[PDB]
Design a protein around this ligand. Structure first.
Ligand code: HEM
Length: 154
């Protein structure tokens, strides 16, 4: 799959809004991940006492985890698919160390799109949601290929 320039521009336009409050987006995305797909919380044992949205919102640690992921993803999206160098260390750590299945990357991709729609409904319409869906699908396809090159199914 290959995105058009129009699709990349829709993705990068909404990402500038993410960056304007990266902490709030990162919190909301991880909270949605943990609440809508509760199985993912097991990958973060240190968050085991955070049982509700408001408890999660108090955690600077959880916020930092979200900002770390959004920062890496933003750098990837700005490469407009020429992101092999950025995916190398991410596949290494997520396949071999954190053991994150590709399905969980699908979940967080979905959570990203839904949080962006919740926070920016007037500027993140159906076309922009579809462009972000394509960009994140490309990310997952390419990282899954790297998982397989490390010997993991994902
Ligand atoms: C857009 C998708 C994601 C991106 C860009 C991303 C990015 C990152 C980055 C940059 C780090 C720190 C460096 C590293 O260890 O490679 C990290 C750490 C980590 N990530 Fe991911 N991540 C993503 C999805 C996920 C998901 C879905 C999970 C679990 C359900 C996960 C679990 C972890 C864990 C356990 C760590 C170790 C650090 C910590 O415990 O806070 N990641 N991630």
């Amino acid at each position: 799959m290959v995105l058009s320039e129009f699709e990349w521009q829709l993705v990068l336009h909404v990402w500038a809004k993410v960056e304007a409050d990266v902490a709030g987006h990162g919190q909301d995305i991880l909270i949605r991940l943990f609440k809508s797909f509760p199985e993912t919380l097991e990958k973060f044992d240190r968050f085991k006492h955070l049982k509700t949205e408001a408890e999660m919102k108090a955690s600077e640690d959880l916020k930092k985890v979200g900002v770390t992921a959004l920062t890496a993803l933003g750098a990837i999206l700005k490469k407009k698919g020429h992101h092999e160098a950025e995916l190398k260390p991410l596949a290494q750590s997520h396949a071999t160390k954190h053991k994150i299945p590709i399905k969980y990357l699908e979940f967080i991709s979905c959570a990203i799109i839904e949080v962006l729609h919740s926070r920016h409904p007037g500027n993140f319409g159906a076309c922009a949601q579809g462009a972000m869906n394509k960009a994140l699908e490309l990310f997952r396809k390419d990282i899954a290929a790297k998982y397989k090159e490390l010997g993991y199914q994902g």
